[model samples]
Target: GDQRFGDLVFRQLAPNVWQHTSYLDMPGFGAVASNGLIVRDGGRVLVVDTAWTDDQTAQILNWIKQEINLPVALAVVTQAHQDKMGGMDALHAAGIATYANALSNQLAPQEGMVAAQHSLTFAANGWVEPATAPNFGPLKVFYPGPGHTSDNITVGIDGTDIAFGGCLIKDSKAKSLGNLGDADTEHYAASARAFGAAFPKASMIVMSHSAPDSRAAITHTARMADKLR
Candidate 1:
């Protein structure tokens, strides 16, 4: 399986984990990138986020089939953000399962975004006020409160020491909170801190843009929150 495309690049971060970055032209915004993760375990594949569109997602699905030789079990959305669930329509059209937290379920359509095809609402109950964290196989989905969006969550991969921070965590070059249209700055620090604390052992933190790096992202995001405060 060649698994290579011009607009999308895949980097094998581990035997079972991959990092895919996709580029799109936004006309007015020039070029922009969105990211997703693929993990193959127990003869099944799990996708951490969706690409920026359905066609892109279809390509990911095809790539996995050709390269990993396993069925895509499901897509775990990190939030209601388009970058995270933008390909839900494509996923559903392909008969794949797409899941997200309760808040994401409630907020996505309200925000004029397409929501995941399935709900991981159980994850919203035990965490209190919002709910408990949810787990699918080795993936533990946790919502660390509001940062980039009210329902943004993080995905922890077992045995891999990797945490997909999604857009809840910023890239190293970010000077300030890139987008605040739906952010809760008052609670961003606590959210980021809680997420960091939950994964103290994580050696790598993957955000929605750029490449993956260390938990120093906790410090980076904290600094931005402080600067904005």
Candidate 2:
């Protein structure tokens, strides 16, 4: 963690691999995001999720350039949210290819939750989504099915299997699971199980809006799924 933000720091989980975790800042929103990661493979780079706003997020990219720049092979849109995939334009400006689910092509959220979100975000960053696959050296994107959103995707690189669990992996200790009025608890569990069924053998499991984690995350989500069932 950083000084101004209260514990904004990056940990080298592996050689040349880092997780830029942010403090659990937005507690009112039932979230305290802590794990943000950066995967650099030789000359390419991948940002798992964003915990900062657009400008600050872009600053992180600038920080990367200062530290060392590899080709931004592709920017994985872990989920469709202002915090996670909001900085597409920043990555776009940096010549990074962005990718999200085909369903993210369309969304209709009521009560200013969904529809009202796109215009501003799109205006801020008209990010082009990647329809192709990327090579992040050792790390590979893990598919956790769809839970938090219809288009959610997880990424893993190197020995670290970071499951950018967007809103899917809820930290029971931090708080209770939320109902967005859209998330299908039953299907959500199914999705988590789908991920479990196909989960790659990862060294660590990182979440989008929680503390840095490990297989415990897998267990917690599994229990969530079990409870719903």
Candidate 3:
């Protein structure tokens, strides 16, 4: 089933996971859409990323409370960009605990976005499993070096095949890297390779700017990044 709240749309991708998409009208870019994940387990929910703004993020929280009738245990920001952590204020206003990569927390404020309430550090090619929240398990957050942004990270849902690639991995239909304003071109290919290697079992790769795709999208992104190098 599909549910809509203003410009935000929630589409079920799996029994326990739904992809929430919102659009941002960029100058000369039309209404570009961004994707996030809402995962439910044991009557509690976990939000992967926020929308482009606070209002849109509020809508997501409302939909979860009214439609899903589940409390959001935690919200995780995968990157420092506006499309990832821009709704930090709304989440905080709702009293929901928020988490992000320590690097993301540092970079978000520099981008004019609010930092999350908590953060965890990870090695360049390492991952972290945040402590499980009440009635919810923690997702594995992996930093595959830098690709989309210096603080970009991927979220792997434990006990499931779904993984939120954020902006580090491209979608299947993407012919080129969308934005490279903060990209590490020299290390992009290697980062993409590390991402693929870290999640060899992930089939449902949910990216930030497009639809969820198979693990093959990781390889496709790697090849694209190589072309840029």
Candidate 4:
């Protein structure tokens, strides 16, 4: 089933998983779309990233309650960018627990976005498997140095072949590196390479600006970053 709520569109990508895309009007870029994930498990829900704004994020929460009929137990923002944590306020207002890398929380304020409620610390190129959050049983958070942002992280469901690459991984259609204002150009390629290696079985790499793509997208992003260095 497909559904739309204002600028937000929801499409089921797999059993128990859906992709939510929301659009924001950029001054010179027209309407830019951002993607997120909503995963349902054991009658509960886990969200990865939020819409581009608080109103859009609230729509997601409303849809989960009114349509999916499940409580959003947890949300994890991949980075501190507006497209990732812009709706932290909405999630916090709903009393839903939100988590992000410690560095991301630290940078969120500087980006003028709300920081997630919980901060998770990961060693460089380290990963943390979901333990207490069994509903997100296969979910794993990995910090692969820095690519799109110093605080950027990738989320993958261990056995599902589904990985949320956020803005660090580019979509298949991307012709450029997109945004590089805060990117670590010298280490961006390495980050993308590490991210690909971290998810060898990832066939569905969910990105921020476009539809979910295959592992090839990671390689493509790596190649693109290589040219920048």
The alpha-carbon deviation from the true structure for residue 89 of candidate 2, after best TM-score superposition, in angstroms, is 1.6
Clash number for every model? 6, 9, 0, 0
lDDT of 3 at 95: 89
Tens digits of per-residue lDDT, candidate 3, 49-89, equal 99999999999999898878988988989888889888899
Clashing pairs in 3: none
- Clash list (residue pairs), candidate 1: 124-131, 125-131, 125-132, 126-132, 127-131, 127-132
Clashing residue pairs in candidate 2 (N, C-alpha, C atoms within 3 angstroms): 1-7, 1-8, 1-9, 2-8, 43-70, 43-71, 98-130, 139-157, 139-158
Per-model TM against the reference: 0.89, 0.75, 0.93, 0.94
Better candidate number, 2 or 3, judged by TM-score: 3
lDDT of 4: 0.84
TM-score of decoy 1: 0.89
Residue 8 of model 1: what lDDT? 76
Ranking by TM-score: 4, 3, 1, 2
Provide the global lDDT of candidate 3 against the true structure.
0.85
* Candidates 2 and 3, the one with greater lDDT: 3
Taking the tens digit of each residue's C-alpha lDDT, what string does model 1 give over 90-166? 88887777788768888888766787766664333223222332336778777777787777878788888888888
Candidate 2 TM-score versus the reference: 0.75
lDDT of 1: 0.78
lDDT of each: 0.78, 0.57, 0.85, 0.84
* Lowest-sum lDDT 10-residue window in model 4: 128-137
